[PDB]
Symmetry: C3
Subunit: 391 residues, 3 copies
C-alpha cells in the first residue's frame, strides 16, 4: 500500500483528531471562567458522538453507493465491507467530521443544553455534513459537475461557518451580550488551542493528498503561507485600529488556514499569498459586520470559517495552477472551473444555512436549545456538568 503513504495518513489522522479538543481549548479561553469546562467538554463530546455515528452509518451515508447523486446508501453501515486502505480513509474522514462539529460549537457558547447540542449535532451530521461530503468527495452531483474541494473549504468550513450563523440566530444572544463585553477568561488557554490547530492543520491539508507526495508537500507549503499572510493582515489591522491583540493575530491566521483548505493542493505560493491576503481582509470585515448587526455568533465560526471557506472555495476556480496539480483556474485559461466552484459554493452556502435553520428550530421546538436564565447566570460548568473549572 506504500508504507510511506500509510504512514503519512496514519499520522495525519492523529493530527486531525488533536484538532477537535484543540478547537475546545481555542474556544474555552474566550468564554467566561464559569463556562470554561463546558466549552472544552463540547469538543470532546463532539468527538465521541462523531466516532459512533460515523461508524454506525455516517461513513456509509457519505461515501457509500450513490443515490441520485445526493447521498450514499447504507452498504457500509457498521463498516460492513470496509477494509484495508478504505479503513484508513474512513478513519481519516471521521476526524474531519468531528472537527466540523466542534467548530460549530461557536454559535452556542455559554448558553446551550448539552443534551440538545448532541441531538442537533447528530441530526446535522446526518442531514448536512454527510450529504456535503458525498456531493464533493463521495462521487456526488457537485463532483460530477467538476467542483473541487481539496481539504474541506466547503465540506468543513462553509458548513460549520454558516450552520453556526443559523444556530446563533435561533438560540439568541447571551444575556448582556449587547450591554457589555464578555471578556476571555484565559487568553493563554486559547493560544494553546491555536497552536494545536495550526499544528494539526499539517495533517488536515497535507494529508488530503492521501499520499506522501508532491501534492502533500505543496499543500503544506501553501497552507503555512496563507496562514502567515492572513495573520499578518489582522496584525496590521489591529495596529491600524489600536494595538495588535494576540487573539486577532491567531484569528487571522485561522482565517488564512480555512481559506487555503479548499485550494491547498491546486495553487502555487503566489496564489497562496493572494488567498491569504484577501481572506484576512474579508474575514475581518465579516466579523465587524456580524458585530454591527448584533448577531451573537459568539466565537466567529461564521466570519472566520464560513467566509474564509467561501472565499477560498471560489479562489480555487480563479487560481488553480495546472502546473501544480493539473487543474487550471480562470487566470490559467479555464473559465469552467470557476463556474463549477460558484455553483458548489452557492449550493453549499444556502443549504448549510437554511437546513441548519430548520434543524435548529425543530430541536428547539422539540426539546428546547437554550438553558434557563439562572443556569446561564451561574454558568454551564456548574449547571450542565456540576463542575468548577478552577479552584
Amino acid at each position: 500500500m506504500s508504507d510511506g503513504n500509510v504512514a503519512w495518513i496514519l499520522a495525519s489522522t492523529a493530527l486531525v483528531m488533536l484538532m477537535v479538543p484543540g478547537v475546545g481549548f481555542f474556544y474555552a479561553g474566550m468564554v467566561r471562567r464559569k463556562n470554561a469546562v463546558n466549552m472544552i467538554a463540547l469538543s470532546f463530546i463532539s468527538l465521541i458522538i462523531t466516532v459512533l455515528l460515523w461508524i454506525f452509518y455516517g461513513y456509509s451515508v457519505s461515501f457509500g453507493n450513490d443515490i441520485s447523486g445526493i447521498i450514499g446508501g447504507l452498504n457500509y453501515a457498521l463498516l460492513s465491507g470496509v477494509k484495508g486502505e478504505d479503513l484508513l480513509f474512513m478513519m481519516y474522514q471521521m476526524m474531519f467530521a468531528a472537527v466540523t462539529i466542534a467548530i460549530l460549537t461557536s454559535a452556542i457558547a455559554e448558553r446551550a443544553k448539552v443534551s440538545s447540542f448532541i441531538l442537533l449535532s447528530a441530526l446535522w451530521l446526518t442531514f448536512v455534513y454527510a450529504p456535503f461530503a458525498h456531493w464533493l468527495w463521495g462521487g456526488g452531483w457537485l463532483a460530477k459537475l467538476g467542483a473541487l474541494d481539496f481539504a474541506g473549504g466547503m465540506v468543513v468550513h462553509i458548513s460549520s461557518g454558516f450552520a453556526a450563523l443559523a444556530v446563533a440566530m435561533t438560540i439568541g444572544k447571551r444575556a448582556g451580550f449587547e450591554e457589555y463585553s464578555i471578556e476571555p477568561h484565559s487568553i493563554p488557554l486559547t493560544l494553546i488551542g491555536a497552536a494545536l490547530l495550526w499544528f494539526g492543520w499539517f495533517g488536515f491539508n497535507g494529508g488530503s493528498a492521501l499520499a506522501a507526495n508532491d501534492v502533500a508537500i505543496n499543500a503544506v507549503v501553501v497552507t503555512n503561507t496563507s496562514a502567515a499572510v492572513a495573520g499578518f493582515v489582522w496584525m496590521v489591522i489591529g495596529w491600524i485600529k489600536g494595538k495588535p491583540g494576540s487573539l486577532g493575530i491567531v484569528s487571522g491566521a485561522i482565517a488564512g488556514l480555512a481559506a487555503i483548505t479548499p485550494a491547498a493542493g491546486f495553487v502555487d505560493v503566489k496564489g497562496a499569498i493572494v488567498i491569504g491576503l484577501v481572506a484576512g481582509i474579508v474575514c475581518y470585515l465579516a466579523m465587524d459586520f456580524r458585530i454591527k448587526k448584533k448577531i451573537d455568533e459568539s466565537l466567529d465560526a461564521w466570519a472566520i470559517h464560513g467566509i474564509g471557506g467561501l472565499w477560498g472555495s471560489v479562489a480555487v476556480g480563479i487560481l488553480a495552477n495546472p502546473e501544480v496539480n493539473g487543474y487550471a483556474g480562470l487566470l490559467f485559461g479555464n473559465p469552467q472551473l470557476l463556474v463549477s466552484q460558484l455553483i458548489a459554493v452557492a449550493s453549499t452556502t444556502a443549504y448549510a444555512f437554511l437546513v441548519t435553520l430548520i434543524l435548529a428550530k425543530a430541536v428547539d421546538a422539540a426539546v428546547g436549545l437554550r438553558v434557563s436564565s439562572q443556569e446561564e447566570y451561574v454558568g454551564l460548568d456548574l449547571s450542565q456538568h456540576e463542575e468548577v473549572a478552577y479552584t
Copy 2:
C-alpha cells in the same frame, strides 16, 4: 527497512513520549493548586529516570537473552549490540516504560517524597516492568504458552493499575481524604492532558504493529471506537446519577483506550464496541468500589488502567477475529486462546499487586515513602520543589 515503516514508528515513538507529560497534566489538574507542580514534575522525572535505566540495563533485562523464560540477560546493557531497527524498537519500547511509571503516580498524589518515588520507580521498573515485558514480548514464558498483548493491556495497564493499588494502600490516605472532597484545581489542565493522551494513543496502539500496515490501521480504528464507546457510557452514567461531568467523560474514554490496548490488533469494530461498552461499565463500578472501601488510590490508575487492562486482556481471548489478524478467540471457535489470556491475566495481576506491595513496604521501611504532615499541609510544590505553581 521500508522507510514507510520506520517513518511510522519514529512518529509513534514521539507520540508515546508525549503521553508521559500528558499523564502529568491529566493528573495535575485533579490535585490541589499546592501540588500541581509536583504532579507534573513526577511525570517528567518518570521520563528521565526511565530513559537512563532502560539504556543502562532496562532494555536488556526486558528483551535480552532469555533465562528460564522469566527475564532477559545483560547482553544489551548500555545498548551493547543493539543496532538498526532494533534501536528503533528499543526506543519505542523505552517510552512504554515511561508512560507506565507516570500512570502509577496516581497512587502517591499529594503526599510522597520525590526521592522515594525515584527509588521505588527504579526498583519497580527492574522487578516488575522488565519481567512483564520479557514474559509477553521478550519471548518469555507467557508468550510461549500462547498469551498475547497487542499494545500493553498487561505490560502497561494491569501493571501500573494494580501496582498503584498496592502503593496507595502502603502509603495511606491523604490527610482529610475521608472527611472532605479534594477539589481539582484546574479541570482545563486535566482536559489538556486528556487530549494529549488520546492523541498519543495513536502511536501507542497504532505503532504496536511495528509497521504502517493493515494491522496498524485496524488498531487505530478500534482504538478510537472503544474510546468513544466507553466515554459515551460514562457520559450516560453521569446523567443517570446527575450531570455528565467532563472528568467522567474523559475518564471513561481512557477506560476504553486501556481496555482496547491489549486487543487493538486482533479484534474487529464489533468486538471493539463490546470491549468499550463493558470497559465503561466495569471501570466505573471499580471506581465506585474502591471509593466505598475508602482506599485513596487517588487518581484511579487502578479502576481505570488496572481493571480496564484486565478486561481487555481477557477480551482478547473471547473476541480475537482470525479474519483480522489470524488469531481467533472463543467466539471464533478457539477455546485455547482464552485460557492463555486468563493465565497471563491471573499471573500479571497477582504479581504486580503482591511484588509492588513488597517493594513499597521495603522502601517505606528503608527511607520512608510519605512526606511529613506539615509538608502535606503546605503542599509538595513548596516542600518538595520549593516552587509555587501560580502567582
Copy 3:
C-alpha cells in the same frame, strides 16, 4: 521520492512548527501574569514573520547560489525554481528559522516594543541566520572546511543564545531586576511548553537525517539520552543546593537537547551520555555566571542554548563515531574534525554576538527597543496588545 522519507519529513516539519509556540508557552509561564500574552504572542509573530521572509528571500539567501561562500544569491526568491523535494526541504528549514527567532525572545522578556522586535527579527534573520545556514548547510565556507552541524548546534542554538546575550545587554535590565525576584506566574504553563519542546525535538533532530533511516533512528536515541542525562544533572544540582525545582529539571533537559542537536547523527549512546553530562554542568555554571554578572538575559537562552550549542558543536569534533555515520572525531583518531569545529564555533559565536550587538543598537537608535517605564509597569499585555491574560 520514497514515500516513507517524505512521510517522515512532512511529520518532522509539523513537529518543528509546534516548537515555535512551544517556546512561547515555555517562556510565558516564567514571566509575570501582566506579560503572559506578550510572551506567547511573540512566538506566534516570530512564526508569521519568518514564514513570509523565508518565502520572499530568506530561503534563497540561505540555500541559493553561493557567493564568496558567505551567502546565497536571490535565485530562489519567492521560491522561484524550488520544486519537489526541494520544496519540502525549504519548508522543513523554514521552521528551524522560526524556532530560532522565538528562542531569542528570551532577551526581551517583559520590556520590548513589538514593532521593534519585528524589525530586529527581520534584520537578524537576514544578516545572521541566513548566513549561518548558508555557511554550514548551504555549501558555505564553513562546510567547505569540513565543519559539521547535524541539526543546528550552531545555526540555531549558538546563534539565538549569543544573540540573546547581546540583545539583553543592549535593552537593559527589567525594572526591579536587581532588587527583587520576578516570580513565574504559571509554572504549569511552562511545563506544557517544555513537553511540546521535547516532543517536537523528535522532528528537529530526527528529521535532520532527511530520511527515515538508521541515522534518524540514532539521532532520536541519542537526543533522548542527552536530554535525560542533563535533566538528571540539574535535578542533582537542585538537590545539592536545596530542592529539585521542576524548572531546573526541564531547563537541564533542554540544555541536553541543545547540546546533542549538532551531534545527534554522528555520535553513539556513550558519546551522548558524555555530551549530556557536560552540558548539564556547563549550562548550569553559565546560568549562575550571567546571574552573578547581573545580566538580564531573562530566560537563559544564552546559558542554555548558547552554551549548550557551543559545547555540543565542539563535542562533535571529539566524539564523532565513524561506525555511526562515517565521520570520526579526535577520540576516534581524527584531529582534523575537532579543528573544523573549533573554527566554526569560534566564528559563529563571535559573529552572532558582535553583529547582533550592532543590529540591536542600530534599531534601538532608529526606533528604540524598550517600552516606556509605565508600560513596563502596567505590563505589555495591556500596553502592547490591549489584552488581559486572565479574568
